Amino acid sequence: ESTRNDVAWYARYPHILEEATRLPFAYPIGQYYDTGYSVASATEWSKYVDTSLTIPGVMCVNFTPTPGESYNKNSPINIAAQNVYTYVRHMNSGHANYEQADLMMYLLAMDSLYIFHSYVRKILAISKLYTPVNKYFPRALLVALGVDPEDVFANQAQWEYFVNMVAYRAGAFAAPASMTYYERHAWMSNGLYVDQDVTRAQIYMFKPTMLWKYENLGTTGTKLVPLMMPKAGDNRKLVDFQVLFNNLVSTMLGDEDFGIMSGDVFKAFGADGLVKLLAVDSTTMTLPTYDPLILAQIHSARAVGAPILETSTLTGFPGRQWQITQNPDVNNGAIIFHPSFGYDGQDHEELSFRAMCSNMILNLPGEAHSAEMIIEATRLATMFQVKAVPAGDTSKPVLYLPNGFGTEVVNDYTMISVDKATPHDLTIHTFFNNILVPNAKENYVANLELLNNIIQFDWAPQLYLTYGIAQESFGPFAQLNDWTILTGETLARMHEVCVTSMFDVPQMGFNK
Amino acid sequence: TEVVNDYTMISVDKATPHDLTIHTFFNNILVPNAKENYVANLELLNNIIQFDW
Amino acid sequence: ESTRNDVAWYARYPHILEEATRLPFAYPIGQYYDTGYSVASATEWSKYVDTSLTIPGVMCVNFTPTPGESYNKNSPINIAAQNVYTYVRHMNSGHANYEQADLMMYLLAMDSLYIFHSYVRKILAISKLYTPVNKYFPRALLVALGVDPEDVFANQAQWEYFVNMVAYRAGAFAAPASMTYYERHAWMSNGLYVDQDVTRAQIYMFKPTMLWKYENLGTTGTKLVPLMMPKAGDNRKLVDFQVLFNNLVSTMLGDEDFGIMSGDVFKAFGADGLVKLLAVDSTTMTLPTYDPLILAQIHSARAVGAPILETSTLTGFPGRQWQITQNPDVNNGAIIFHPSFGYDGQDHEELSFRAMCSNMILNLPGEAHSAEMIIEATRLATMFQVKAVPAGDTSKPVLYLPNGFGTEVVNDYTMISVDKATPHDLTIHTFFNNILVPNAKENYVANLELLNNIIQFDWAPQLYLTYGIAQESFGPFAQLNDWTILTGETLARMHEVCVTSMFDVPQMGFNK
């Protein structure tokens, strides 16, 4: 109120002001809204007049749990493995039939079980959320997690008791509760997050793209291979999730080394020092919360692309499948996770991943920034460093090696919105931070619609838009507040700090 | 009461996987005429001048 | 003293310890020292036994005074020009026959006069320094400044009265004392700086490579062209410095616009608000001091190469001569100083300037770093950003455009040492931070001798060494303590802060 005092006509005629400005302001999001025409003769311009209004509701961040780029014995996961093997095997009198990396790959396989339990209990808790002001609940959230929303309705008791039996069978193995790795992955994948703390707010979720399936070799070693989770249009019933859990714990319950290591972690950390997955009942409902740290790391999130499988065909890159391996003959018996990024799921080059080869912008709210805020805002950020070298003469995709990544990486994002054409059903759009717009007339208004749906989300990921007609990318499509240019070594140092913090156990005698 | 035989400097490799490097040297150092010796000897001299005394 | 208590034989036999360890430790630096042979028969190995010991004494930093990369009206020098013209012309009732850039180029031409007076009074004050413990005084310092050391001895009264008459004739023009630009350039170029604060210490100096000579055009505008100062082997007498001062102030004392602007600055800032060059007498001696800020900026100093003159021949780069120009028709009447770097004085490519194309390392003493320490340590640092585009088909040199530079740039360094061969006279070595070592047997022990002379200096500039036999450069040859990788935008922000601070006048009403 700089120099405006009042009009003072509105004060002595407040009734005329009242019935002149009586408007409905609370439109329920979840449905299509037609604005109508101002000029009624404008129906002769069919598409030149836009009367459509579609607010999006859900953006699901699709992530992969990682140990954090181990390529030698001086890795954070290998130092954590040495600490946990010293505490379990030597500080407590543990068994001698396994090694320091067997314990850590067991403890990494336990996190996939905990993420799976958090995922199915989010599926269960979502299906009881119904609101008049939000018509996206719960079908858009259930579609974004990849389930059939009618199967969770018609089989609610079977779903709940499956969640409880998953938490009960997870007690057969032991993992320490003071690892904040498990606590962070549980806190991320259990939770609905609003973007600006209003009534008709937009919802952020975290769904696993894949989990790590424990594969036992002979004397060759021990692997962790991807187990793919359902994507946002799959309509998977309870039987599919039961199959996923059964081949997740198949090689774990019959393994004798896992039984020995489970008993060792149990007697080393006690019974109250272990991770407990708490049981839900019929009145357990999750609610959407407001967390400005979650939004801070969603805003500075850089997608790395699809996981590379053993069945994935990549010309010029034969052996680049994502796996956490361990061979005592290779690399001094170190845990090795060194993945190539930039894969989009096809045997060609995603041409827009070139736009992710400039230094990122770490944008933050406010004007004062805590150290914990900066270390939390960079958790989903992953910068590329170098091209992966192709074997042979020709190679269709372009793979990237990073300079460190955090305790999880983002694969892509999935946005759920309503359609602008009839019957105005839900629309599922999956995208990375880089978006290619090919030279075709049907892609421009589609990309502009996707851009306007993205800017509805408050701390949205920053986008990079490559136009194939121009051979040109545009940089970070976001509103910046208080930002800094971040190079690869700074982000690498922050990633090293967080991965060392996530795999630390304060239950141990290490620096009492 | 003791003589020095050698020194052994432990640094990190600048090529991947960036494992440790073992360099054993006397006070005296020969640099024979090859291109792979001058920059390596310069790296070793810069590694040695990081150590104060 | 961790676990060593004593020997206790040295306590009850202290006399045997006394005459067993009676050694001379204070060798005067400035002369050659022969160690001798341990194995007396080793004269059969002529050069395979090194018995020479030469400590260097002087490293002179050869600098250019700059306004700091003006290429548009939003430059720091143009904002300073607008402020000083607002204060002199409008806040005080000043004359209307000049513009905002005429004042600032007048005030930039005054700094060359002040640097010249500081330079000749350093020459005068050095010649009375004689020490038994340092035989480099004063001949090595006088040689490094480019004078004949016998001419300053035999003509000491003429030299002193020339310094005093320079300070007296500089009073005909007026410049404000509260510009810290003049104070910084005077404090740098008046002073001998020791490297570690000992008796037989190494000396750092600052000599101007060139000064800015005011050239008056017609209605085309106003220029500042280089006036080259003598280099370290020139043996210039008093008559050469009198010629340099006379063509420095030639176009300044007869110019009517300079008289009007001098009277305007005089009546705007008063008489006590002006820069006064204080008069010296026969008992004025400078002494070497210890300044850890000077060493902090010498350590993080990056040379930019030779100045480009109008007579300098550069194939493919016809109009790249260094000049501070101003045309009211060009670029909205802005001061323009946009120089190309990487020139070595010849019409070929200095091949080692490629080694200065990686990000610099800002190294600092201690473990805690003040903001003023970081802003002072980066003053002589200048990083390249892009190659200058060559005109035509072929071009022999490779020129560089920076991303900002401070209030002065370093051109090269000159080290003075004694020769290892007879008659062990003074040797003058001029070098940038990048040093090329060509494939020839006479260059390897020469480069190793230059490296060992450089590491005698405590906060020496970091070197980059290109070997022509290997097609390979090695990075920063220095001992690092507490360092950071610095990119171009961070150094640009620091340069902008310092140039805005250097050209600020607190005598004005600007933010009372």
From Swiss-Prot, chain B:
Q: Which domain of life is it from?
A: Viruses
Report the PTM annotation. Answer: The 7 kDa polypeptide is acetylated. Autocatalytic proteolysis releases a post-translationally modified peptide that remains associated with nucleic acid within the virion. This peptide is observed only when nucleic acid is packaged in the capsid.
Q: What does this protein do?
A: The capsid protein self-assembles to form an icosahedral capsid with a T=2 symmetry made of 120 subunits.
What is its quaternary makeup? Homodimer.
Q: What else is known?
A: Picobirnavirus particles are capable of disrupting biological membranes in vitro.
Q: What is this protein called?
A: Capsid protein precursor
Query: What's the source species for this entry?
Result: Human picobirnavirus (strain Human/Thailand/Hy005102/-) (PBV)
Q: What does the organism's lineage look like at the top?
A: Viruses, Riboviria, Orthornavirae, Pisuviricota, Duplopiviricetes
